[PDB]
Structure 1
Amino acid sequence: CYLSETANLGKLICIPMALRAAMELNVFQLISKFGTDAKVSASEIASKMPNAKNNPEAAMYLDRILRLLGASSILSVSTEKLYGLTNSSCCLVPRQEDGVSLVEELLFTSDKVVVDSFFKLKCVVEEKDSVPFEVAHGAKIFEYAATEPRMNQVFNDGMAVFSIVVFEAVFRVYDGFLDMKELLDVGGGIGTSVSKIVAKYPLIRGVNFDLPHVISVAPQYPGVEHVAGDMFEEVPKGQNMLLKWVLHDWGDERCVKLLKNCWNSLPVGGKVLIIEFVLPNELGNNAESFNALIPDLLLMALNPGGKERTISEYDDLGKAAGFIKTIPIPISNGLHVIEFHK
């Protein structure tokens, strides 16, 4: 009956926006600053909030946003209501170690520019060659970013803090980093990714490869030697090559051409490591299943032409260039490390 689905389906938008506002207001942190498995009032949390000081009602409005995150299991409740951090609410407290937390990723996935793009998802389907983001902002995404600092930050801050947790995950399972001479990181960005590798495997020689306009600003890393160029023209010579989140940006023709350029500048007895989220064929309310789908949608909103992929499809791509024995390694919740051997 309807008055069922008015709640089931009507909560769907309400939760993320309530979460977002909580993140924006620190909440998840200010709560942790009180203790281990602690349990706090709205009136308290708002008391540890500078620009609330001037607002009386600060208390009651916060209690209304929180009880939603409560009922959502995103927070935990006791009785004046008392909220406390949860398993999948701890990823929102920045570590005292660095400052890391899922916050920066999530504030990006749900940014007005991402959602305003989603608000036009119905266009990939109706109009051929429509870019939701373009339809939504009337600029090529890279044009927009060039003139929109806040948008640029949010994207970079996000795919970084993310990349970190993605790498901590690979520096836990994967062993293949022991017994490497050099990795050549393709579309390596400004080298951070590999910087990380060089420092936990000094055994390795670091080559960051990306476009000249990128490389020119890349910081200087011990082990990381930068090299500018067009990976679609020619990847540089090397033994081990990284492709973390590069193939999902690109189609099939183009994905091959890059994977080809890698075979060439790679010796026999040597592999291209490809760090991705592999799309199961059995999609379910699995984090396996959802870690592929989130990007697919983001990829449809921001990059009509990219796509996440099933282990079947990587193996088709990473073979029509001339590889064999594509050895996929499960890492966590879908993070595979599809090895492409020459």
Structure 2
Amino acid sequence: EIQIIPTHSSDEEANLFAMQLASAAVLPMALKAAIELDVLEIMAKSVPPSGYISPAEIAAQLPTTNPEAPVMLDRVLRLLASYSVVTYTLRELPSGKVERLYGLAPVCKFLTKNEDGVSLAPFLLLATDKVLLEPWFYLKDAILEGGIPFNKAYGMNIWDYFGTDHRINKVFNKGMSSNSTITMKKILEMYNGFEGLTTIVDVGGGTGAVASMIVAKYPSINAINFDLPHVIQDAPAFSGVEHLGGDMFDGVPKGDAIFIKWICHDWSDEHCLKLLKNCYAALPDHGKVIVAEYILPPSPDPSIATKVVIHTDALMLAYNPGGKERTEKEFQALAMASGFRGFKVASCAFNTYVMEFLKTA
């Protein structure tokens, strides 16, 4: 709490932060272009001995003959580098002009395929898709009028819309599947709560990536992946997973445990309660709901981990019917209100906490 006295110097920084904010979208939009160009994968596969590659040497590997591609790439990569998305090194030219060569930064491990063929890049392409930008033009309308920005832009809710637009359905389902594969692989290394179950139901389990992973690790479990019919239609037929289409607000398939990852955050308290009562009803006396969600931090602190949660809260506001992020006590109160007697935070990976709503304490 030392007080900063306003000066020329502090005004310069305040004015420039306002300008940075004004044009902040250039970052995710330039990163989206780089990933669609396969630039980061090119960098990963052809980084010379040194580990730094020129924009011309990148552009050489693209399907282009545009002679401006190298300078255009340099300009994109310079932006990325300023934000530590790639690294750089400088080398002096014959002219005494200085050129930049670029390398992978640490974050690139999650923006290029790992050994399992997976990354967050498909998640980025989801979040920056033209479809999911459009609701942001209706956010002020939703605050004033009530309702949901997405539904103002499209005339229907997000799921119904994905049911009409095959391109974005596939982008969405793949963004979620890849992200969830990375998180769940880490969850499964640490969390033991699937052990001993004979049946699990992944409610809102998407194309079934998670369900497949749980059965791969526990071949004695019966796994049901449950989602909307337009998602189930082109879920891979993973062995040991039964895909079932339906609407979870109507009810859910019976199992020993029900897994819900990134389901509660999509829905209002009232919708969650209805879903969680349906879950309680589909479980045996001793069963549980396994809830995988972020947890809101105590304050809007500046950490990246906090910002991810808060960013996601803002995504939920733009996209979903009452969806929001919640604190640990908020999740506990949803558990209690839907009849569950026990609550615990069992595990965490990449911000995603694994909570158990226990029918019996």
TM-score, normalised by the number of residues in structure 2: 0.85
Matched, 1:281 2:304: no
Matched, 1:18 2:30: yes
Matched, 1:85 2:104: yes
Query: How many angstroms apart in 1 are the aligned matches of 2:58 and 2:273?
Result: 53
* Secondary structure in structure 1 of the residue aligned to 2:110: coil
State which of 177, 188, 202 in structure 2 corresponds to 1:160. Answer: 177
Partner of residue 337, structure 1: 354
Q: Deviations over 1:143-165 (max 9, x none)?
A: 54344333222222211111211
Q: Is the alpha carbon distance of 1:82 and 1:24 closer, same or farther for their aligned partners in structure 2, counting shifts above 3 Å?
A: same
- Is residue 39–residue 83 contact of structure 1 (8 Å, CA) maintained in 2? yes
* Secondary structure in structure 2 of the residue aligned to 1:16: helix
- Taking every aligned residue pair, what percent have the same amino acid on both sides? 43
Query: How many angstroms apart in 2 are the aligned matches of 1:141 and 1:234?
Result: 20
Matched, 1:121 2:139: yes
Q: Is the alpha carbon distance of 1:261 and 1:37 closer, same or farther for their aligned partners in structure 2, counting shifts above 3 Å?
A: farther
Moved more, 307-316 or 114-123: 114-123
Matched, 1:205 2:222: yes
Partner of residue 326, structure 1: 343
Q: What is the identity, as a one-letter code, of the residue corresponding to 1:232?
A: F
Partner of residue 119, structure 2: 101
Matched, 1:27 2:34: no
Aligned-residue offset at 1:213: 5.7
Matches within 5 A, 1:56-67: 56-67=67-78
Aligned-residue offset at 1:228: 4.5
Aligned-residue offset at 1:259: 1.4
Query: How many angstroms apart in 1 are the aligned matches of 2:144 and 2:106?
Result: 41
Query: How many angstroms apart in 2 are the aligned matches of 1:62 and 1:297?
Result: 31
- Is residue 28–residue 90 contact of structure 1 (8 Å, CA) maintained in 2? no
Query: How many angstroms apart in 1 are the aligned matches of 2:87 and 2:154?
Result: 39
Matched, 1:69 2:86: no
Partner of residue 295, structure 1: 312
Query: How many angstroms apart in 2 are the aligned matches of 1:153 and 1:216?
Result: 11
Query: How many angstroms apart in 2 are the aligned matches of 1:59 and 1:188?
Result: 42
Partner of residue 55, structure 2: 42
Count how many residue pairs are aligned between Structure 1 and Structure 2. Answer: 338
- Is residue 277–residue 291 contact of structure 1 (8 Å, CA) maintained in 2? no
Aligned-residue offset at 1:205: 1.6
Q: Deviations over 1:162-198 (max 9, x none)?
A: 1211211211221222222221222334433212101
Q: What is the identity, as a one-letter code, of the residue corresponding to 1:105?
A: F
Query: How many angstroms apart in 2 are the aligned matches of 1:170 and 1:30?
Result: 30
TM-score, normalised by the number of residues in structure 1: 0.90
- Is residue 279–residue 292 contact of structure 1 (8 Å, CA) maintained in 2? yes
Unpaired runs of at least 5, structure 2: 1-9, 91-98
Query: How many angstroms apart in 1 are the aligned matches of 2:104 and 2:259?
Result: 37
* Secondary structure in structure 1 of the residue aligned to 2:261: coil
Q: What is the identity, as a one-letter code, of the residue corresponding to 1:73?
A: S
Aligned-residue offset at 1:282: 2.7
Query: How many angstroms apart in 2 are the aligned matches of 1:333 and 1:190?
Result: 21
